[PDB]
Amino acid sequence: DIKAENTDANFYVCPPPTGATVVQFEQPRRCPTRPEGQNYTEGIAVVFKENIAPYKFKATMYYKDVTVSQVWFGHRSSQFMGIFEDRAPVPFEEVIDKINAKGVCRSTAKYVRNNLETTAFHRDDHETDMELKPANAATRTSRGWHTTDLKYNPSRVEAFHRYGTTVNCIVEEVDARSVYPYDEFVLATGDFVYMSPFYGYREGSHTEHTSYAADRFKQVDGFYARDLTTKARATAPTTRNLLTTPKFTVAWDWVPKRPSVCTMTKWQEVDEMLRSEYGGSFRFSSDAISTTFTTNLTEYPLSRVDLGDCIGKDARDAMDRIFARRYNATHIKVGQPQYYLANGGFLIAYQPLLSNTLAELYVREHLREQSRKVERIKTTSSIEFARLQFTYNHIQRHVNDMLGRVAIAWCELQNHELTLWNEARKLNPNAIASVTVGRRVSARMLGDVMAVSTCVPVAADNVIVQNSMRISSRPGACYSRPLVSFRYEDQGPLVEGQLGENNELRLTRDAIEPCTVGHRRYFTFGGGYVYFEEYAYSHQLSRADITTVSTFIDLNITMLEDHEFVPLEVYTRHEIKDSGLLDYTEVQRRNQLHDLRFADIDTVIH
Amino acid sequence: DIKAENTDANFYVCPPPTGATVVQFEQPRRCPTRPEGQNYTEGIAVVFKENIAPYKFKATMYYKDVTVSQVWFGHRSSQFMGIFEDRAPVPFEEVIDKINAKGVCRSTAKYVRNNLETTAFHRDDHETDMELKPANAATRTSRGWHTTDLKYNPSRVEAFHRYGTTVNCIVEEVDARSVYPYDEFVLATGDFVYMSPFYGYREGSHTEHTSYAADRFKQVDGFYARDLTTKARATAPTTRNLLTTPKFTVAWDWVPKRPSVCTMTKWQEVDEMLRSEYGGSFRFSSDAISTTFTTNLTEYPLSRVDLGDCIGKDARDAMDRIFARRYNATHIKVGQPQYYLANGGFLIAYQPLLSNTLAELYVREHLREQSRKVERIKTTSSIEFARLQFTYNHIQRHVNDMLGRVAIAWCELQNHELTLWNEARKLNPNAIASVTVGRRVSARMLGDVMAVSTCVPVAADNVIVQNSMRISSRPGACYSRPLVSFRYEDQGPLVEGQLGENNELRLTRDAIEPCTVGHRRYFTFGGGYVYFEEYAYSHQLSRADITTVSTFIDLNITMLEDHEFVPLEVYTRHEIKDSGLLDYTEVQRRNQLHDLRFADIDTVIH
Amino acid sequence: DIKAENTDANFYVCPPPTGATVVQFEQPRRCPTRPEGQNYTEGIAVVFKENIAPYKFKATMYYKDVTVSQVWFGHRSSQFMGIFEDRAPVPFEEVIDKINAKGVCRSTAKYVRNNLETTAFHRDDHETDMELKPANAATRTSRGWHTTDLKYNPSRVEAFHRYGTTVNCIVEEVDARSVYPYDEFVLATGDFVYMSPFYGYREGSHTEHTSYAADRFKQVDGFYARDLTTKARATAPTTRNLLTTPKFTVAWDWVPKRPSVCTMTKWQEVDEMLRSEYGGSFRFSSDAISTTFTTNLTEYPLSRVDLGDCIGKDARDAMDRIFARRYNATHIKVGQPQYYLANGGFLIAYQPLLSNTLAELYVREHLREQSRKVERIKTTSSIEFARLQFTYNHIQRHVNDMLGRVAIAWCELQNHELTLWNEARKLNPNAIASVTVGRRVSARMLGDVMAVSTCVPVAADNVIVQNSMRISSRPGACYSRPLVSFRYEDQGPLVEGQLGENNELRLTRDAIEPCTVGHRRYFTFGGGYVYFEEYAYSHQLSRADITTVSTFIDLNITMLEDHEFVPLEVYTRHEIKDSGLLDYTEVQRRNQLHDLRFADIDTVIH
């Protein structure tokens, strides 16, 4: 006579299957396997970069400031009518006999200006040899020497225009700088020089560039310089180039072009540079600098490189030094040092290696080193793409390694679990089966197979319980589970059955049991429970009350949340530009406006 | 009489529950679901950047080196008193009638210097028209032409000051360069020119900038140039600007400002630029370059951009060329090309797309393209923040995708597992229950629920076994499990029970069994085993001996270890700066020290 | 008489074990635990960088363009013989009495040139005081003023050489710029000045650098400037430096060196800068800029820094302003502001913090702030290594956090699973055991242990079934499972047994069963099934037919695929260089070729 308290569930009549429909538990699947593991070859690496450093060398300038001053005299004053200042070369001979020999210098200048030979006499007086005194010391200045420090104008002869000459033999060490092709260089003064620093006579150095005549250059063999301050003769000789331009006479110690120059610079040395082979490329991993390189499989011809001899010396010099401190007692060099080109344009020198362990493998890999086998290379300033490559790769693996491993433990588990479901199905088919089919049913074991038949739904408001459970027709023998009556649909007849497990509606009431004392049980009725006390209904219940426990194992996985990368520079191109103390462009844009701003440019009088 | 060998464990008396405390297995939880999946719209993209390239064009300089030389003669020598060198413009008329027509040039100069008109005659001789010969070929030099190559000084008249003039009409092609606003430009020589290259008369070009008078500029219409070397007349005419500065006469072919100029440069072309919508922004993914862009939802007005017409031509020119080689047979353009602004300042042109597949969706998305709808933009040099954005995002997903998927397989598993625990509990409640409650207990099935009662601990040193298992009161009927006696506490009475499963202390000995031959068994006693042989104790044991097998499935997960990112530049700002051959600042800092170092600056004589 | 249809499997005879070999289920392992969780200390941070900005200040130039022109007159024309132009300083006195007082200027120049005092008179006429008019307005130009705008040449006296003087007192405001050590600076004009801007007399400013005499510098105390355009006297006084170089007289308002200068620049302000302690270093995480810093544990002495006072003011000024808008009501400053040095060279100022929550912890951490306790620092331009560090770390954790958590849920699961396998083994040992041992066997429970004995293989082509299952010797009592006969090897005798579960060959046929109606079953025979209908063979079968269901739970894990990072720059070093309008190097390389190209350099006549 008693209904249900909560109807947020559904009942099901489970008529035994006939065998019509038959299923089977899916057999174990085949589990994936971890890759054979990447093979990393050890090897010392050296990375060269496009040398943007100008070739630098030292030199010395020899010239004479020639200044002629004209003056007009007044009754109680005077004025410069014109100061015509000029700068003349110190003839080759004077540079050797006077300056280099005795630290002296002629009081005259003698050179060619405007297709003509002029001659200046200091103070318009007879010629003399004057000693060279050091120039005034100044903050951050190369060494400088000169003849006199006082100019010379005409002696007073009132109401007249007189002329006065001033000669100052100046010599100072400067810094010259040349760039590829090295067919011309510049001094610290700004004076350009249109000859190769490597020009000369010895050893084919005469095919170097010169835009000058032949009587201007004079290479001196076996040359000992006499310092102009300490006055000491050089202990060793040099081959000395001496060029004489219309404005000055440069000189410098001649050296060969190939050894003194190189279009590449040793940039990064790497102890451990892992080399691997991925789909027709080599990945040079450097854990140290966090950088991975991508190259081709075949080497790169050094001979194809324009002026790149330092590379050889530079590289080997390092691979030896490293092999020493490190590989001297653990590894061995494999094949000769190899050279490959990387994306962006970084030249990489490599020396494959093997530990004393795998000594037995030398033979094979040695061949693999040999199977690897006039312009200039352009390199990028940004090495981020590689560190991205490195960082991404480094992570691409771990994630896939761990997640890959996980995948396998899983497959093995599901297959491993089958064992249990198999046993469980025999025990409680109606329960195990349902889950598996996805729908609520009833099933039986036709040997080694299952045969299922669906269970018909029944609303809860169509279910009644009997206030008792005792049998009178068999006293001392009651039912193990509560008695109930139910309805199909709403207007259909009323049926009676015995309450089963998990709201099954059993058509039979053969689940009998010899009555006993201390009989107390809870039976899942509706969306909750029904507590019968001593073979008699007591009251229903919600599932909330009954203390809940868990067969589930928890796992708290949050997701990785978004993040914005703000554009960030340490120094903007604006700062970088501003940093410069002087700006040529600005200086000219300003200075060249002078006559527009401060003067009249078109006005003419007659 | 026999104790235990190992006492690193604990015993438990498990008195049947009364039903007082009752629990229930937690019901299946609800499993999360993978997001609906991100919607990526295909589209061809073009990315423009702040054009830092100066506007560049070609021109030609017309001037005359005017040099007056004064000389003093001696008995056996001579000297330059003053060489006053000047540089004069070639008047507009002469540039057309003499130079352009016949490759000739006047032997005179005629111009205004210092608010006055001066006239120089070459060699101080009557005027002439002289032909223009090519200048001496030099390494890397623009074309140059001139009149004469020999200077001119006065003929000898001993003991006198004489005057000599030298005129050299020089013409040479130079490279001019202008920057925004393009109201002035510079020549390859360093000479500034304070007029817009776009100045002129035609089509409002007269509102361009000029800091000069009107008689200095002269635009020539229908202009055919006669090459000075090949002597050939141009086949096509140009509008020719001719400005005459106090120092020289520039000239160049006039062109419009808007088409010839643009404040942006087509930088990167992208075939596949995925566009997505995340919380009020568009993420432009380029797999190719590894770069993701962040923009607003509404477009950006090109009209708002200052001088940006090339952008239009540039963009479309590309989206067509790409759509051709690629999208010609697979996709279709959606709406008009759209323009959005990205962080950092990269202008992005986009052309949304759809494959022939989803042709039925054109209508809707077309509107979504239209719903999208005078200064200059500043762009950063660093595109790393984006490649970080890209790289991070690319990984942020996979990890969350896979780990997300995992989470779900888990929830489903635990719920799936419940089925088993349910069956297992009926079988062996005391075992299944314990694990679940967390503590060791005993339990019974009060229908569809569990009722538990704790088990009291018993030290191992308080446990004794009987050397036998045979019953005399029922011969041919022994016990299935060993006999034992135990103690509560240490000083308490001694109790007798039957050994149960996993060290349970059963209060009853009703586990009887008809004796049999070949009876041999191991029973978990203490921290090990007790091997009874033929219903009689034989000896205890440690668990070590018994071959162990595993129900567990292994998973080896290591963690991702730290890594340091060393600061790494390919070229330091120091190198970058050094690379430059000449440094204006250095040159001036040095040169301007001259008089301090090598001369006397305050000394005065009278 | 009937064989098998499919033989892609194997049969096994499973003779009961004797107890010889005995095993045991591995006991639960100990599960790892998540780390105690990283402790992050909140704190406001400010990051300074190597200041590459030149020190900038304003000044004013005072000079006089002195121009002497000489002309020769002809019958119908004239010419400049020589224009000797010079530039003279405006004496200290004139700068105060004439220019600053009345906006006037002397019509004469009076200075020292070439160790001699010259005197120029404008127009060669008596001295005058001339007013200073503004210079012609020009695009983007500092203020300029001058005396006259018309030059002056000699009046016509035909057939003669006459002389004319021109003096133009010019004054213009320029921008000076100095760099460390700030012992010299330059003007906007390009004129260098070899004195420290901080030189003076007051407060030890006389130990600053000067390469000049003492009569050239003149610091004026209590100085009010009278604007030359508005003519207004300054409302406040300044200490005014006035240096007089041979070419011009600079002047500027003197200021102290330490406050006006600093070798570092406040670069990035960070509200939330997480500070953590990892193996002897601090990691400064800024979520905002995506950047993590690495420093030492002990602070860095500011006193050790050369000229770094602005840092103090700059830093605190910010930490206060932030603490205001934010920490004013939630946190509290902990200890004094601390300073540490980071890799690459970024100075970081930090102010540790605690929320009002953990107020009780102030005491301890305060000490930890104190336990933390003349050159210049070099900073890198690339901040990518840090954003890599940040990005990598940020991900290194999540992956390890989640995957770590996973590992634990696993261990707990396997141990949790043991419970089930334990129950399952009792039920079906032959099944549960096999899986566990890895090989197919049969086993029995010797109490609390297992005893196994292998099962011998039997080819399928050696297996026959009986067309029926009914017993005649016991009518109304048949077998539950099909009858079969089999062979060991190929030539061995024929044995008879009863079909068991999963192709076991039972030696006994005691699995009898009282015959029943509606008997229909499938028995796994060979690689498929055998369907007996009513105790009689009907036909074999393949496993394909029988509807398959799954006990396995799916998990779809793909791997993270490779990706190439193309080298990518926004502006190449080539563009960066090109961008510059003028290039000094180019200008000189070109200009200095002049005489080679356009003239004769060696030819001499006599």
Ligand SMILES: *[C@@H]1O[C@H](CO)[C@@H](O)[C@H](O)[C@H]1NC(C)=O
């Ligand atoms: C790497 O080397 C191992 C043995 O050293 C070898 O078994 C394996 O084949 C190699 N890796 C690959 C991908 O072939």
Ligand SMILES: *[C@@H]1O[C@H](CO)[C@@H](O)[C@H](O)[C@H]1NC(C)=O
């Ligand atoms: C490697 O060789 C291929 C084929 O010549 C070429 O396309 C590719 O650019 C090369 N890679 C590098 C790093 O230059």
Ligand SMILES: *[C@@H]1O[C@H](CO)[C@@H](O)[C@H](O)[C@H]1NC(C)=O
């Ligand atoms: C995670 O789930 C919740 C917190 O979100 C909590 O109830 C549970 O105990 C947590 N599990 C573990 C072990 O982290």
Ligand SMILES: *[C@@H]1O[C@H](CO)[C@@H](O)[C@H](O)[C@H]1NC(C)=O
């Ligand atoms: C993406 O498109 C699909 C169908 O094309 C749609 O079902 C889904 O709603 C869209 N994504 C989101 C997040 O709405």
Ligand SMILES: *[C@@H]1O[C@H](CO)[C@@H](O)[C@H](O)[C@H]1NC(C)=O
């Ligand atoms: C997008 O619009 C918002 C609102 O005007 C603005 O704050 C933000 O700066 C814009 N984003 C970009 C990329 O400029």
Ligand SMILES: *[C@@H]1O[C@H](CO)[C@@H](O)[C@H](O)[C@H]1NC(C)=O
């Ligand atoms: C991982 O665990 C250990 C090695 O740490 C080893 O005993 C076991 O076999 C490994 N499992 C697998 C399958 O990697």
Ligand SMILES: *[C@@H]1O[C@H](CO)[C@@H](O)[C@H](O)[C@H]1NC(C)=O
């Ligand atoms: C971090 O702080 C917590 C309490 O605030 C403490 O228990 C823990 O020991 C600290 N972390 C470490 C690694 O010691």
Ligand SMILES: *[C@@H]1O[C@H](CO)[C@@H](O)[C@H](O)[C@H]1NC(C)=O
């Ligand atoms: C920190 O101190 C150690 C020991 O003096 C030193 O080697 C290291 O370079 C320092 N770190 C930094 C950031 O300079």
Ligand SMILES: *[C@@H]1O[C@H](CO)[C@@H](O)[C@H](O)[C@H]1NC(C)=O
């Ligand atoms: C994943 O496995 C396959 C697709 O590869 C499919 O049959 C299955 O349904 C998928 N499982 C889930 C839930 O993603």
Ligand SMILES: OC[C@@H](O)[C@@H](O)CO
């Ligand atoms: O470029 C010439 C080369 O020698 C230098 O850069 C390095 O030594």
Ligand SMILES: OC[C@@H](O)[C@@H](O)CO
């Ligand atoms: O033309 C030179 C002018 O611009 C100033 O530099 C003079 O000091």
Ligand SMILES: OC[C@@H](O)[C@@H](O)CO
């Ligand atoms: O800046 C002017 C523009 O035309 C060039 O940069 C590219 O063509």
Ligand SMILES: OC[C@@H](O)[C@@H](O)CO
């Ligand atoms: O003032 C010019 C001096 O610095 C040298 O460049 C001369 O060669």
Ligand SMILES: OC[C@@H](O)[C@@H](O)CO
């Ligand atoms: O370098 C001097 C300093 O004061 C400036 O860079 C910032 O104010």
Ligand SMILES: OC[C@@H](O)[C@@H](O)CO
């Ligand atoms: O020597 C100056 C020449 O190179 C040109 O700049 C003249 O206009």
Ligand code: NA
């Ligand atoms: Na003489």
